[PDB]
Structures are given as C-alpha cells and as structure tokens.
C-alpha cells in the first residue's frame, strides 16, 4: 500500500550524465571471397541489426540489457573489473539474467565513423543481510449483523532488509525479485526505517514505533499467498476452503482471519478465486492471539482512515470519547 510514500528519481540520470560527457569531448577534440567470410559478416551484422532493433522500438533506452547489447562474455568481463567484493562478483555471475534485468542500455552518439552507447550496470552494495517479507490482510469482526462491521488492515506490508544500521523497506514487494532464498531489490523503490519498525509484528500497540493501519467497514473476503502458506480473510457468506491435490478439501475456514501452511496443502479457495499456494520447503509457526479488532467499539471506531496508525486511530477514538464524556454533565 505505502508505495505512494516513495521518493522520485531519474533512473538513467547517471548513464545520461556519462552520455553528455562523450558529446563534450567530441567538441573538445573538434578543434585545430570465402564462405567463412560470408558467415562471419552475417554473424557480426546480425548483432548490429538487433541492437538497432531494440533501440528503435524503445526510443534509445533499453531494459533489460539483451545479449545483443552485451554478450555474456563481455558482461562477465565488466563484472571482473568492477571494484567490488568477490562475493559481489560471484553474486552477479550466478544471477546474470537478473543483473541484466536491472541494467539499462542508453543510446548515445553515432558519429559516422563510431557508434557508442552507455551501459548502466547495477552495483549491489548490500549483500547477505537478513530480509523478511511482511504479508498483511484485512482484519474484520465476526459479527452476525450484516452492515456495521469494523475492519482493520496493516498497511506496512512488503520486504524489509537490514541495511546499514537501518531497515530498507519495500512497500511494493513486487519491486523485489526472489531466487530461492535470495532477494533482489532496488533501493530506489524503498523507504529507510529505524530497526524499531519490527516491533509492529510482535506488539502492534507498542509505543516505540507507531504501527500503520487502515480502517474501513468493507468486510470483503480474500486471501494472501505467503512464502510458506496462505492467509485467509473470510467474512460474510463467502466459502473459504483449503484443499489437497489428491485428497481434496482438507480444511474449511470459519468467519475471521485464519492461516494454513503449504505443507500438505496445494490450493486455497476463497469465494470464486482459486489460489495455488507456494510449495517451497520451510517451517511455519502459528502464533495464537485475540484479533485486536475485537478490542474496538464499532460505534466510535474511525472507519475511513486511509493512512493512519494504531496510536493515531486510538487518539482519534479518545477525541470522540472526550466529546461524549464531557457532555452528559
């Protein structure tokens, strides 16, 4: 949700900056047969046509960088001469398709005698720090009355990574790429948070960090597929089940927010939507606890807070409560 809090940058500002320098020194110096032969030329020229093809349909800026722009050999050579950690080099070599996805190719100059373009490669200054992905889903009451239901949703979902004494937070987990247990992310799509942001997971009413939520009265049902299971927010009259591939339905969810692990579960159905759970191996822990939505009185609960927080919602309740208490008198 909180993707709108992100800053705004110029993605190719560095490569374009380099491109502008090549123009300057241009003006700065601007001052006072065989069949094997046929094959090699088609091979070399093919590449030129493909590079030209990519530039012409992308208006001169391409991403990802193709093997036509930069062959695996040229890329590996670049990687070897970067001033980086051998683990940074090794990281990039084993994930060359991802490096490719995070690179830009920017068309620069074509003087009739020389064609030049700038290749902007990612450099990963943060490696092997712990990351965690936070999944959230709407938490509503299990009330029998139709309308007048209250809901609450943590809005701080996304990837979190240790980074330089702080936490890089990626509100749009979609910006992150996952290879086994490795998380490839771009810091340009992140916020920098204090390590205390993690307190929202253990104690959502904690004073050190103001945990973010949104409120509503839309008690609609859905599911969130996690890394090792599935969260099911089942409300109203929605049919919510969890099934196994050979055995069939193995669990029926009641109204409220619940969870099932992917161990022995293949799919999850919420309403008319079938979700396949992720089949990755790993252990899941169910932490029991009362839904905090039950602690609130639906009559003074601010039900349209798009960007609020736990204490902010609470203080808004006190103001509404103060209006009442000092009235009867």
């Amino acid at each position: 949700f909180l993707g709108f809090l992100l800053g705004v940058g110029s993605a190719i500002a560095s490569g374009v900056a380099v491109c502008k320098v090549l123009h300057l020194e241009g003006e700065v110096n601007k001052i006072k047969s065989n069949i094997e032969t046929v094959i090699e030329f088609q091979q070399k020229n093919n590449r030129l046509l493909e590079i030209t093809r990519e530039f012409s349909v992308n208006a001169g800026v391409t991403t990802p960088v193709s093997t036509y722009m930069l062959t695996n050999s040229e890329l590996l050579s670049l990687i070897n001469d970067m001033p980086i950690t051998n683990d940074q080099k090794k990281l990039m070599s084993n994930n060359v398709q991802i490096v490719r996805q995070q690179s830009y190719s920017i068309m620069c100059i074509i003087k009739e005698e020389v064609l030049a373009y700038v290749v902007q490669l990612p450099l990963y200054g943060v490696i092997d720090t712990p990351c965690w992905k936070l999944h959230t889903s709407p938490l509503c009451t299990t009330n029998t009355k139709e309308g007048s239901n209250i809901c609450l949703t943590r809005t701080d979902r996304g990837w979190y990574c240790d980074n330089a004494g702080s936490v890089s937070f990626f509100p749009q987990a979609e910006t992150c790429k996952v290879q086994s247990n490795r998380v490839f992310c771009d810091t340009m799509n992140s916020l920098t948070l204090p390590s205390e942001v993690n307190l929202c997971n253990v104690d959502i009413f904690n004073p050190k960090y103001d945990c973010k939520i949104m409120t509503s009265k839309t008690d609609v049902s859905s599911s969130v597929i996690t890394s090792l299971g599935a969260i099911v927010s089942c409300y109203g009259k929605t049919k919510c089940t969890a099934s196994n591939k050979n055995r069939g339905i193995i669990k029926t969810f009641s109204n409220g927010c619940d969870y099932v692990s992917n161990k022995g579960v293949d799919t999850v159905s919420v309403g008319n939507t079938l979700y396949y759970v992720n089949k990755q191996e790993g252990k899941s822990l169910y932490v029991k606890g009362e839904p905090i939505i039950n602690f609130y009185d639906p009559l003074v609960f601010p039900s349209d807070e798009f960007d609020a927080s736990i204490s902010q919602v609470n203080e808004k309740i006190n103001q509404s409560l103060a209006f009442i208490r000092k009235s009867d008198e």
Partner: protein, 61 residues
C-alpha cells in the same frame, strides 16, 4: 532455511530466512562499435545501411 510466522491477533505473517541483494549504485561502461554469394554480401550490406540510417534517425535534433 526459510521460516514463517502467522499472527492471528493482527492478521499478518512474516517470512524470514532471506538474504539481500539490493541495487544501491550504478556501474557505467561505454560500449563502442566501429563503423565504416557476392549478391548475398549485397543484401547484408543493405541491412547495414538501414541500421545505420535507423540509428541516425533516432539521434535527430
């Protein structure tokens, strides 16, 4: 070693065990291309001219 925890009280889950690989910077390198059965060479040399021409068009004004 990837693990996951579900919190019933706040309807949320945390997946741990991941390792980071964050793009923090850029490395810029400059790539240059040097420019200048017989009939087969002809259609390939023509392909060459459309490529140079096409590149000349995108680098306009």
């Amino acid at each position: 070693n990837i693990t996951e925890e579900f919190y019933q009280s706040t309807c949320s889950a945390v997946s741990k065990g991941y390792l980071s690989a964050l793009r923090t910077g850029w490395y810029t390198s400059v790539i240059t291309i040097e420019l200048s059965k017989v009939k087969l060479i002809k259609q390939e040399l023509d392909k060459y001219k459309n490529a140079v021409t096409e590149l000349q068009l995108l680098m306009q004004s």
